[PDB]
Amino acid sequence: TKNIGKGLTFEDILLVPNYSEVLPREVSLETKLTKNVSLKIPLISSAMDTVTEHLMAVGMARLGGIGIIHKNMDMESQVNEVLKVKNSGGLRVGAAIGVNEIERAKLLVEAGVDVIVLDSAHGHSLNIIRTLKEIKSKMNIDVIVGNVVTEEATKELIENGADGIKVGIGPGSICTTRIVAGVGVPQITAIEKCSSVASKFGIPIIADGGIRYSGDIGKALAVGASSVMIGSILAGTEESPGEKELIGDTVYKYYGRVKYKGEMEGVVYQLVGGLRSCMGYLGSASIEELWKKSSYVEITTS
Amino acid sequence: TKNIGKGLTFEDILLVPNYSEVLPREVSLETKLTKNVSLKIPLISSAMDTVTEHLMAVGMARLGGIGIIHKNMDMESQVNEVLKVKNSGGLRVGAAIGVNEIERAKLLVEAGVDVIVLDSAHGHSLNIIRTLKEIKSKMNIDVIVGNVVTEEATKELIENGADGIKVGIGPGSICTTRIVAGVGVPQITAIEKCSSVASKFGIPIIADGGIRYSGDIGKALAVGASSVMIGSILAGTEESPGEKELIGDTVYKYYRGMGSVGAMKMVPEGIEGRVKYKGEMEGVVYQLVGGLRSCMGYLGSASIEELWKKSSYVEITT
Amino acid sequence: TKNIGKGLTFEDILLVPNYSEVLPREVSLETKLTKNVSLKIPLISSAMDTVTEHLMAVGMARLGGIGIIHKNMDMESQVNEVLKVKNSGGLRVGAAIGVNEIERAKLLVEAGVDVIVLDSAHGHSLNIIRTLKEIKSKMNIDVIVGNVVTEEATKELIENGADGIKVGIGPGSICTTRIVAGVGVPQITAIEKCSSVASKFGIPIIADGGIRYSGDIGKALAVGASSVMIGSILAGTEESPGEKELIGDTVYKYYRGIEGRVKYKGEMEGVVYQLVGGLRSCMGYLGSASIEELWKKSSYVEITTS
Amino acid sequence: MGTKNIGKGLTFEDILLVPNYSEVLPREVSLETKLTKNVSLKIPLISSAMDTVTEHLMAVGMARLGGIGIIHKNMDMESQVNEVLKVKNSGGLRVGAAIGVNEIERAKLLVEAGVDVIVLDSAHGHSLNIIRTLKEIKSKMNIDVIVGNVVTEEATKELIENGADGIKVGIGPGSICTTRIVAGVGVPQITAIEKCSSVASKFGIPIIADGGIRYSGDIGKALAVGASSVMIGSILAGTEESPGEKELIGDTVYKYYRGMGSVGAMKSMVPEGIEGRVKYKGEMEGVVYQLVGGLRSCMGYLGSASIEELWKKSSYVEITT
Numbered sequence A: 001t002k003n004i005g006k007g008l009t010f011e012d013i014l015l016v017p018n019y020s021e022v023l024p025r026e027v028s029l030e031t032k033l034t035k036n037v038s039l040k041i042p043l044i045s046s047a048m049d050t051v052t053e054h055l056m057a058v059g060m061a062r063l064g065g066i067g068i069i070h071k072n073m074d075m076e077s078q079v080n081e082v083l084k085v086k087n088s089g090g091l092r093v094g095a096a097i098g099v100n101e102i103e104r105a106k107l108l109v110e111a112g113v114d115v116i117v118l119d120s121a122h123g124h125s126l127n128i129i130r131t132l133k134e135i136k137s138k139m140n141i142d143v144i145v146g147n148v149v150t151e152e153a154t155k156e157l158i159e160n161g162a163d164g165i166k167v168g169i170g171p172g173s174i175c176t177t178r179i180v181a182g183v184g185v186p187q188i189t190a191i192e193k194c195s196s197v198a199s200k201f202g203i204p205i206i207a208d209g210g211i212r213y214s215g216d217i218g219k220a221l222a223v224g225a226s227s228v229m230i231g232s233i234l235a236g237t238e239e240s241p242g243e244k245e246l247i248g249d250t251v252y253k254y255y256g257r258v259k260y261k262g263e264m265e266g267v268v269y270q271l272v273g274g275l276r277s278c279m280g281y282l283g284s285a286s287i288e289e290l291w292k293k294s295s296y297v298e299i300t301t302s
Numbered sequence B: 001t002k003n004i005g006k007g008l009t010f011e012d013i014l015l016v017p018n019y020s021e022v023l024p025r026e027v028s029l030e031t032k033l034t035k036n037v038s039l040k041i042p043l044i045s046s047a048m049d050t051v052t053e054h055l056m057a058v059g060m061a062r063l064g065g066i067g068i069i070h071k072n073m074d075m076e077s078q079v080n081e082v083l084k085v086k087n088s089g090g091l092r093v094g095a096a097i098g099v100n101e102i103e104r105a106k107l108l109v110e111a112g113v114d115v116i117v118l119d120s121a122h123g124h125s126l127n128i129i130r131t132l133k134e135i136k137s138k139m140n141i142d143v144i145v146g147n148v149v150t151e152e153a154t155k156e157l158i159e160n161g162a163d164g165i166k167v168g169i170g171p172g173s174i175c176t177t178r179i180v181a182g183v184g185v186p187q188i189t190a191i192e193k194c195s196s197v198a199s200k201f202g203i204p205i206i207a208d209g210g211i212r213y214s215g216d217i218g219k220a221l222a223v224g225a226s227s228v229m230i231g232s233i234l235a236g237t238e239e240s241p242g243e244k245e246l247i248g249d250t251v252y253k254y255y256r257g258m259g260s261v262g263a264m265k266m267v268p269e270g271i272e273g274r275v276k277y278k279g280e281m282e283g284v285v286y287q288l289v290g291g292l293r294s295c296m297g298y299l300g301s302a303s304i305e306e307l308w309k310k311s312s313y314v315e316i317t318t
Numbered sequence C: 001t002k003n004i005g006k007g008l009t010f011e012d013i014l015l016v017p018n019y020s021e022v023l024p025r026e027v028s029l030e031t032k033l034t035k036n037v038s039l040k041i042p043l044i045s046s047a048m049d050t051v052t053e054h055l056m057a058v059g060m061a062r063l064g065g066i067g068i069i070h071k072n073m074d075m076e077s078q079v080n081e082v083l084k085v086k087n088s089g090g091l092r093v094g095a096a097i098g099v100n101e102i103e104r105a106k107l108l109v110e111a112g113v114d115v116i117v118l119d120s121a122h123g124h125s126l127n128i129i130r131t132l133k134e135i136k137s138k139m140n141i142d143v144i145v146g147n148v149v150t151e152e153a154t155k156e157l158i159e160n161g162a163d164g165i166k167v168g169i170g171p172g173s174i175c176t177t178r179i180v181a182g183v184g185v186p187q188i189t190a191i192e193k194c195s196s197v198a199s200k201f202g203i204p205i206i207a208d209g210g211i212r213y214s215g216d217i218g219k220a221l222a223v224g225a226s227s228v229m230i231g232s233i234l235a236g237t238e239e240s241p242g243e244k245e246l247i248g249d250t251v252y253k254y255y256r257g258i259e260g261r262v263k264y265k266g267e268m269e270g271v272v273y274q275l276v277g278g279l280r281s282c283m284g285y286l287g288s289a290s291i292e293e294l295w296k297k298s299s300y301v302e303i304t305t306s
Numbered sequence D: 001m002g003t004k005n006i007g008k009g010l011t012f013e014d015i016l017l018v019p020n021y022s023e024v025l026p027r028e029v030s031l032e033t034k035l036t037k038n039v040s041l042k043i044p045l046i047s048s049a050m051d052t053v054t055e056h057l058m059a060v061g062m063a064r065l066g067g068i069g070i071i072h073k074n075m076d077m078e079s080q081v082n083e084v085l086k087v088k089n090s091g092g093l094r095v096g097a098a099i100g101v102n103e104i105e106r107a108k109l110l111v112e113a114g115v116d117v118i119v120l121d122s123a124h125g126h127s128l129n130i131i132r133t134l135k136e137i138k139s140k141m142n143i144d145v146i147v148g149n150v151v152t153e154e155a156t157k158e159l160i161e162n163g164a165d166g167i168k169v170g171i172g173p174g175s176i177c178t179t180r181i182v183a184g185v186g187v188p189q190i191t192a193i194e195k196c197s198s199v200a201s202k203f204g205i206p207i208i209a210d211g212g213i214r215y216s217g218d219i220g221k222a223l224a225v226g227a228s229s230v231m232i233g234s235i236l237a238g239t240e241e242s243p244g245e246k247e248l249i250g251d252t253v254y255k256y257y258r259g260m261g262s263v264g265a266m267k268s269m270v271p272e273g274i275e276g277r278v279k280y281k282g283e284m285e286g287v288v289y290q291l292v293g294g295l296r297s298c299m300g301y302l303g304s305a306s307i308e309e310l311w312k313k314s315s316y317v318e319i320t321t
């Protein structure tokens, strides 16, 4: 049968409470971004022109996470954005590249970047793998490759030198892939499939897209991810790369338009709190402890 | 797999009628709150600062149920509220306590409380059990423990001296636990799993949160619960705490979760808002009780014990 | 657990087309209302304060169906309503009674009523069964008994003398039993359950409530029912009880303890024509020349929420 | 729990295509497909046989882009012939024509006009009248015959045996369709294509997925699951090449769109179609390129260089609403 089964998304499930000995404040949110880079919190700001530039990356790094500077600009600009983050405190920083963009990656590495995010709409392709091999042979850096949803995809990327795999075809807030192409796999299932491969190799999984609430972070992690990438939640915050605008009562941020969210610190604080509480309910002091102990129930939309 | 099954809530379910010889009026609503405390009607008012204080507890007790005084006040104030209910006839009351609140527990027991509700967002925890053991070893008192959703939780609480188990993580109009933490089990499935353990030991199940209509009470009880704890339905009534406010045409009263920003003044796990004034709570409780009697008429059950014996339900689509 | 399965409503299913030799215009719609009262179309108007009196029962009867006069009136008044129909061309007519209403039934049978409809919210009662038995012992008439949703309930009523079984607890457009009592069985599942008993004894099933479109009639009949009782579909019509009024260039009349207002639906014939037409089309798709063929040939697919 | 329940029916919105390893860019994808046993197309798109989507201008544009148009039968015989001939005058272009039950005179004239496919169109294709018409045509005329509409294995098997060169699937879908409401009849489209393809692929008879296409993604879903081509009406209604009149209401330009079994369409049985205005979609060529791009993107995700590759490699997941 062509039907491989029932795909489950964030809103379809709820995590089941376990016996607990840990207070939410006692929980350790420390995780691995790649096999050689680690973070204090499992949050990553998306590589979109509407979410992560130098300001956003500085904020994320100071709060224990990491920003990925988007590639939608010239090489010199992206290297500059990376330098600005490194200048103010010597923080953790990442940057995205497309296919065949070897020189871009090279200059980003020399700028001091900690991770290169090899992004594409369909990560399980020839050209993505060729770029991966080419990067690994020409420069010394940890590479995150995406996006994928299947077992074979995850296996082939790890074998070709991937230091982390990014999961997500479909869930993005500004979606078109599900409608234009009719292609995708729901996030919970997508993480589950990819985790069964990656954890045998000890390779971290980044859950990318579809996060609406702090609860979704807990589900994505509990299901097998090591970190979570967020876009829309951070889009519209003061630190996002836009300018403020006024329409009636409400303040907006143009580039494209989304509602102003205020300081990012308040937004990140709530996400962290929600995750701490989640891991409290499930009696897990660490994310690795969460993987071993977590379970969920299917829920009707209602 | 991590998928343990499909969870069902109140709205996903409909009770199947049985052969009936009992009119709604003939129905006995007698039930057990704890191992040693009994109720005339299986209704409890939630331990919340917008639902239950002394007026609510008197109203509940006179109608055959029980009010449980919230813990969002000082010990001296909570004792006084218990003493004010005991001031008018032989009325039964409960009182809520948090983790490691042994002094509050001692004072309420000595204030002549009938039950103590050891209340937690996550009832299956080390802190709860140790607080349970303390009170059970040192005080003569029935203790309801919550909140839980698993069979492992209920068994462990019962073995450590729980006289009643309160079930509910996720349901409740003001609850946002499942949004902010992604945690919960739908209420019917929750009761079902917990009831399978609790009935073996003869320990009553309190179904807490998620009741929107009188038909939900019947569903909770039919599936294995002994009583139902309600908050939102009694929130707007005259007997609930907080003053009344008229905005426009209709009068409003404030309803607030305990894990809400206002109530805490920990990540917020409850919403806050105004709800319409609902008149006297006895008019409200009458409707709920009537619906339960009607429900048990359909299933042909003269008692809740009988209800448990001949209950069945169907799943429904959206 | 206590989960007896998944309950399907009209909106949950679609009928699968079969090989067809019959055009919609050629199919027969003749059915049995009771054990020994038959209709030319499988439509019945609800016994409600707001849908069926003498005018409605006449219109229904002249179209091949039948009207059940509601009980919410004097025995004298209800007998008179039956009288106005019978003398309007020997038309078939039914009348509703409640529990213990033996005398009302007696006078209605004398008035020459064709069917008595023993109405209860819960037909599987001691009081319903003894009312049925007391009617049969004292008078000679076909009795439809309802409402029920289970196979055990259907059997007991048939054993006690029920000539028709009315099915429907929960699905009625104006019903709140699902909300007040939390009780019910979705209409398709309910008809399926009761048919597995009643078809063996040759006792017709009346599908009652939930019919919102003509396509629902087909589903109800296809799944085992002999006829459908329809309420809100016929509520705003000219022939229904109530007066016309204008509220902002729109004509209205009431539908039901107050229970909201409905728009004027015009002449009842046009409404019935569409319903009958839709059912003919359905039976074309399923290649069924008769309702008996429909039962033998029917299959349906479950449909997702979207 | 049955007993007349045969399973859960899946529609376009119920499933998602699972990506595979890809070596193919969207630009390098072959969209060439089989229309009937003997006729083939360069893009797998057909314009519906409706009096509000396809006449000569629509058919010309469709063929000019690698697809085909089916001239609707809601006109007299000589009018339909003239439409077929008007397509023939603007280059050696392929064109189809719709036909109703027992309309043999119509079929002979349409074949004379140089029609490439006869579409024996019916609401219920699995009937005794349709099979009789199929047998009469295939014995009396040299022409490829697409027969619809059907949803079952038995239906498609019987039509193939009686000389159907193509099977058209779809009872239930269609933006303007109310068969589900009026009759309570239908099968969700994914399930319908699956059931019919399982038979038709054994005989190499192309399946036409008819109705229910709202987005370019649906085309991929229909093809991936077993269809050879996709018939569309809704998304072509209101284009510059559609036979309707252009009309300004407020700030937006509108054109009319109606089902063939609607009240207005039957004027010039009970209605099984709704009618309404649709926003002017502009040039048709532009609308098709978006569909083709999304289709290419889809096959790029599944790493399929041709539709034959797509059938062999495609798989999907069920999703909740």
Ligand SMILES: O=C(Cn1c(-c2nccs2)nc2ccccc21)Nc1ccc(Br)cc1
Binding pocket: A020, A022, A023, A024, A277, A278, A280, A281, B120, B121, B122, B125, B177, B258, B259, B260, B263, B264, B266, B267, B269
């Ligand atoms: O305690 C809380 C939140 N919370 C609540 C509730 N939240 C849900 C239901 S009642 N009521 C409160 C009153 C005062 C301050 C916080 C409060 N969350 C939490 C506790 C342990 C664990 Br493990 C995980 C999470």
Ligand SMILES: O=C(Cn1c(-c2nccs2)nc2ccccc21)Nc1ccc(Br)cc1
Binding pocket: C020, C022, C023, C024, C281, C282, C284, C285, D122, D123, D124, D179, D260, D261, D262, D266, D269, D272
């Ligand atoms: O023929 C019709 C209605 N109808 C339709 C369609 N309705 C649905 C899909 S195409 N297109 C028409 C064009 C002209 C006049 C009526 C038309 N229904 C029907 C026919 C046989 C059988 Br068995 C069952 C039902």
Ligand SMILES: O=c1[nH]cnc2c1ncn2[C@@H]1O[C@H](COP(=O)(O)O)[C@@H](O)[C@H]1O
Binding pocket: A046, A047, A048, A121, A147, A168, A171, A172, A173, A174, A175, A176, A177, A208, A209, A210, A211, A229, A230, A231, A232, A233
């Ligand atoms: O336009 C798009 N097309 C496809 N994927 C996108 C697009 N925009 C954002 N995404 C993905 O969605 C993620 C952000 O998801 P969000 O947090 O739901 O907004 C990004 O990291 C991208 O991987």
Ligand SMILES: O=c1[nH]cnc2c1ncn2[C@@H]1O[C@H](COP(=O)(O)O)[C@@H](O)[C@H]1O
Binding pocket: B046, B047, B048, B168, B171, B172, B173, B174, B175, B176, B177, B208, B209, B210, B211, B212, B229, B230, B231, B232, B233, B256, B257, B258, B259, B260, B269, B270, B271
């Ligand atoms: O703020 C909170 N967050 C989550 N649950 C709460 C909160 N406050 C009260 N509850 C629970 O929700 C129940 C009330 O539910 P309701 O009657 O359906 O509105 C109470 O009995 C509490 O157990």
Ligand SMILES: O=c1[nH]cnc2c1ncn2[C@@H]1O[C@H](COP(=O)(O)O)[C@@H](O)[C@H]1O
Binding pocket: C046, C047, C048, C171, C172, C173, C174, C175, C176, C177, C208, C209, C210, C211, C229, C230, C231, C232, C233, C256
């Ligand atoms: O007040 C009510 N409660 C429950 N059922 C009702 C009530 N009123 C009418 N009904 C039933 O519902 C049917 C009408 O449903 P409708 O066709 O969906 O409008 C009638 O035939 C009655 O048997």
Ligand SMILES: O=c1[nH]cnc2c1ncn2[C@@H]1O[C@H](COP(=O)(O)O)[C@@H](O)[C@H]1O
Binding pocket: D048, D049, D050, D149, D170, D173, D174, D175, D176, D177, D178, D179, D210, D211, D212, D213, D231, D232, D233, D234, D235, D258, D259, D260, D261, D262, D272, D273, D274
């Ligand atoms: O009036 C009708 N009732 C039901 N289906 C129709 C009617 N008219 C056209 N159709 C079908 O609907 C298809 C168009 O589907 P659409 O592109 O989704 O709007 C056509 O190819 C016809 O097969």
